[PDB]
Design a protein around this ligand. Structure first.
Ligand SMILES: CC(=O)c1cccc(-c2cnc3ccc(NCC4CC4)nn23)c1
Lengths: 8, 266
């Protein structure tokens, strides 16, 4: 459910 | 001159290593980006925009991680940055602690606002404010902004380019590919504040971003909900200015960073 989101 | 330690992480920003300056054992971070991977350059010669922006903001003390030096290589640039010790990024702090107590969120949010004001006063827009780009100095209770690789010089005209994080990007970017710097920054701050008091970001999909329905998944005070909802106004001109944020009633009586470390981090 919770995650990092890379740029771009 | 620098003794290279382990790799801390890598991604769209390049590869970041722990390091120590030999000359005096100062902890540093050593950041490598390949030239082919860089798109936004600036004016020495053509440097990556991160170097231009970091130099604009690295003078004096602030809540921004400071550029100590940089080097060009044939295929890459290397940046030497401050490294607090010990140090956890805000994304991981939140994952491990869940939703933050409001007193703590207030202290963190205040510090981020001061850092962003600093950047804007220096003519710099970060454009990727999010928990992954904020370090906590766990002993001092101080927050530091990192990663200016998607930033730009601050201007009063429209931006039609964006390589920051989409889930922190405002509805006007999603619908129109157009935004103004400050109002887009304030939106990202709303996302960040929600993330802190709820334990994750409010929106995952384009449709949620443009719908602008804020649902609170945790118990959050009425005053805090009001501030978040104001930062997340669909119309850019309906969002608060930095002054209005800092004057908001939820933002009064902020703890000092040392108090914050003592009560919440130590
Ligand atoms: C994690 C850490 O100690 C540190 C310290 C100073 C600067 C940076 C830094 C500077 N620019 C970036 C861009 C991305 C980034 N990622 C967070 C950790 C995985 C490298 N760190 N980072 C990280």
């Amino acid at each position: 459910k919770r995650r990092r989101h890379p740029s771009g | 001159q620098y003794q290279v330690g382990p790799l801390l992480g890598s991604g769209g920003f390049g590869s970041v290593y722990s390091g120590i300056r030999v000359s005096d054992n100062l902890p540093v971070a050593i950041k490598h980006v390949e030239k082919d991977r860089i798109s936004d350059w600036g004016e020495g010669t053509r440097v990556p925009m991160e170097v231009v922006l970091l130099k604009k903001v690295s003078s004096g003390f602030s809540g921004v991680i400071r550029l100590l030096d940089w080097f060009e290589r044939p295929d890459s640039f290397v940046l030497i940055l401050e490294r607090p010790e010990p140090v956890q990024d805000l994304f991981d702090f939140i994952t491990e602690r869940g939703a933050l107590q409001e007193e703590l969120a207030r202290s963190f949010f205040w510090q981020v606002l001061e850092a962003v004001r600093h950047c804007h006063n220096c003519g710099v827009l970060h454009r990727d404010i999010k928990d992954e780009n904020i370090l906590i100095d766990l002993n001092r209770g101080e927050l530091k902004l990192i990663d200016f690789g998607s930033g730009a010089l601050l201007k009063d005209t429209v931006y039609t380019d964006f390589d920051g994080t989409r889930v922190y990007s405002p509805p006007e970017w999603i619908r129109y590919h157009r935004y103004h710097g400050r109002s887009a920054a304030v939106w990202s701050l709303g996302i960040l504040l929600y993330d802190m008091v709820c334990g994750d970001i409010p929106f995952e999909h384009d449709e949620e971003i443009i719908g602008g329905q804020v649902f609170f998944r945790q118990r959050v005070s009425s005053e805090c909900q009001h501030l978040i909802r104001w930062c997340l106004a669909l119309r850019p001109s309906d969002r608060p200015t930095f002054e209005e944020i800092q004057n908001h009633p939820w933002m009064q009586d902020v703890l000092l960073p040392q108090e914050t470390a003592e009560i919440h981090l130590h």
